[PDB]
Amino acid sequence: TNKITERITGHTELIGLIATPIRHSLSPTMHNEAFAKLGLDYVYLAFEVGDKELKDVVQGFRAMNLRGWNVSMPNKTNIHKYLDKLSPAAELVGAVNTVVNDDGVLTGHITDGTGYMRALKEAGHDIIGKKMTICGAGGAATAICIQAALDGVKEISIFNRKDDFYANAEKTVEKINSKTDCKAQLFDIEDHEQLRKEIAESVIFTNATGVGMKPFEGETLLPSADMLRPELIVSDVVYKPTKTRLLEIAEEQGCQTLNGLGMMLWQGAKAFEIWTHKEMPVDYIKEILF
Amino acid sequence: MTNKITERITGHTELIGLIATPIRHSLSPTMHNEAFAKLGLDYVYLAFEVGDKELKDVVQGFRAMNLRGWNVSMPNKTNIHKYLDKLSPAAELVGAVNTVVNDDGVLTGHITDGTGYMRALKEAGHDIIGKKMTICGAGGAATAICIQAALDGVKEISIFNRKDDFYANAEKTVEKINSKTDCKAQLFDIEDHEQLRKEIAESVIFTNATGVGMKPFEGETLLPSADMLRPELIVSDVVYKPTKTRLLEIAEEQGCQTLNGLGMMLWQGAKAFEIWTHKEMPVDYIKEILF
Ligand SMILES: NC(=O)c1ccc[n+]([C@@H]2O[C@H](COP(=O)([O-])OP(=O)(O)OC[C@H]3O[C@@H](n4cnc5c(N)ncnc54)[C@H](O)[C@@H]3O)[C@@H](O)[C@H]2O)c1
Ligand SMILES: NC(=O)c1ccc[n+]([C@@H]2O[C@H](COP(=O)([O-])OP(=O)(O)OC[C@H]3O[C@@H](n4cnc5c(N)ncnc54)[C@H](O)[C@@H]3O)[C@@H](O)[C@H]2O)c1
User: Fold this and answer.
1) How many CB atoms sit inside 10 A of residue A61's CB?
2) What is the superkingdom listed in this entry's lineage (chain A)?
3) Nearest to A60 among B29, B34, B65 (CB)
4) 3-state secondary structure B208-228
């Protein structure tokens, strides 16, 4: 006996993911499994789209009436030119990773920061009204620092090395202090004495850099274990490995820890809720993915 | 060893589109997604509501998206050549495109309905190559069939159609056939029953390529009387919903061998499937699932 098994028919609609490289992404599995579970007639697909293709793809998407899509490197900071509106965070961050189409009007959103903050809250970590020291000034750190500010974190000390992102960090600081009530400051990651004071004075220490992840597995920006203390919360955006070097040291010091699994899941949920006004079953998806 | 990921669509899966409007009740996506699943090809087929105002932006967007290919239907078949790079011989002579394939950034337009019709006949043991056909219709499907038929080597084709918007198209099709193929084509009024009787009597096959037999015209047929048919004559209809139109009902009763449009539909898909993947769609397996 043989019958129809494909849930994809002429009624099925598309949610995209446009970036490059991108085909190894886990996001399609996340959303497809989420749609399947909820009985939603959508499929999610990734497309290799870069600078040269971006304008055409978005015009194409409007013409195809797509409900929305994700956007990843190297399009996140450029896509606003082809959108109609931006969420407060996208406008403040200057990056878009999620687009939604409402009656032809394209609104750009940024869900990485939201996801990160949500994952903390779900993990039972309250950093609202408290201080955070964070490493990094890239796409993720920026979204985290701004969403954190917008959510009510009182103070953020940012540490980054003197590379291509330091100037972005400076903007993040300036953006945070001028258009937010959160107080932010930037420090060189090599300023180890300042790093010590900032960590001691923070309820959370967060890695938002590629350090800890390939090609830097087994490496941490943390110079010494004695900069951590038992009550300190230590988090990392990295989740492959499930325990970075930083999170290993953290456990050894008695700290409570959290890798990036939560953040990737909840940034997916955010996107999903934006497109469907439904809650992604994170616990279910989590099981399926890991 | 457990693997709950039951969804075969990942960041690797590529897209084959269908652009037209209306188009969401189309069966094509089931057809290809089932074929892809069965063969293990990492592809998915989706439909998009695309019409005149959206066509140019969509095709330009599929190029940017580097899609492998897509199907095209009403009302885009005759306008799409404008945004393509090359056309198959049949696509250029027909002037319509229903299938596009992207080879290294170069988009080629193909027309598979005529190909699908002829293939279905051959699979059903009917050889009309070098013979005469009488056909009813002057719409997209009839035009594709007549032109492909001529290209495949049909010797002569008598076309019948009512005096509606399509008659002018028929005349054009006749001219295309006579001037660029070795086939002889003539056009007659469908209400000229005596010419119809004669053409059918001189043909090896009689084909309906109009919407008569299909709702809102079920139970109805353009064939004025059973008298015009005979046991040897092959009678075919492009319609397959219903699977047995009044025409095929009458033809059967007169001892004729019949064939509905179910093969045309399957083999039109098969052709597309083959232009895109260079593989054979398993028609037999897909027919079980669909119908
Ligand atoms: N959990 C999630 O869902 C999630 C989401 C986004 C990003 N991430 C992870 O966060 C990390 C950074 O992402 P991004 O998009 O912001 O990257 P990015 O390229 O935008 O930023 C790179 C950041 O890491 C720093 N950096 C890189 N190499 C370094 C080194 N050797 N020493 C010191 N600092 C270094 C840079 O200064 C900068 O702050 C990646 O590992 C990524 O996988 C995780
Ligand atoms: N088997 C397949 O895969 C396949 C593929 C394409 C079309 N079709 C079917 O073939 C039929 C025609 O397709 P098309 O796209 O060429 O249609 P079309 O709208 O382009 O053309 C309609 C044709 O039918 C004729 N017609 C319609 N109503 C009539 C009537 N009451 N009396 C006399 N003539 C009439 C017109 O004269 C014209 O030639 C439809 O029923 C369609 O569903 C089947």
Assistant:
1) 25
2) Bacteria
3) B65
4) ECCCCCCCCCCCCCCCCCHHH
Q: φ and ψ at B12, to 5 degrees?
A: -85, -40
The conformational region for residue A104 under phi > 0 = left, psi -120 to 50 = alpha, else beta, is left
Contact A60, B57 (CB under 8 A): yes
Residues in chain B within 8 Å Cβ distance of A17: 11
Resolution limit, Å: 2.2
The conformational region for residue B125 under phi > 0 = left, psi -120 to 50 = alpha, else beta, is left
The ligand that comes nearest to the alpha carbon of residue A97 is: 1
Which residues fall within 8 angstroms of residue B122, CB to CB, at 6 or more apart? none
Strands A42-48 and B132-136: unpaired
* CB < 8 Å from A in window 14-53 of B: 15, 18, 23-30, 33-34, 37, 44-50
B105 is in an annotated binding site: no
Asked whether the beta carbons of B271 and B277 are under 8 A apart, the reply is no
Tell me which amino acid residue A285 is. I
Q: What is the C-alpha to C-alpha distance for residues A122 and B147, in angstroms, rounded to an integer?
A: 65
Instruction: Give, rounded to a whole angstrom, the gap between the first and last alpha carbons of chain B.
Output: 37
CA distance B247 to B221: 6
Contact between residue B28 and residue B71 where contact means Cβ atoms under 8 Å apart: yes
* DSSP state, residue B204: S
State the count of interchain CB pairs (< 8 A) between A and B.
Answer: 120
Distance B220 CA to ligand 2 centre (A): 14
Check if B140 has its Cβ closer than 6 Å to any atom of ligand 2.
yes
For chain B, the residue count is 291
Crossing angle of helices B167-180 and B140-152, in 10° steps, is 10
First to last CA, chain A: 34
Domains of chain B with CATH codes: 1-113+265-291 (3.40.50.10860), 114-264 (3.40.50.720)
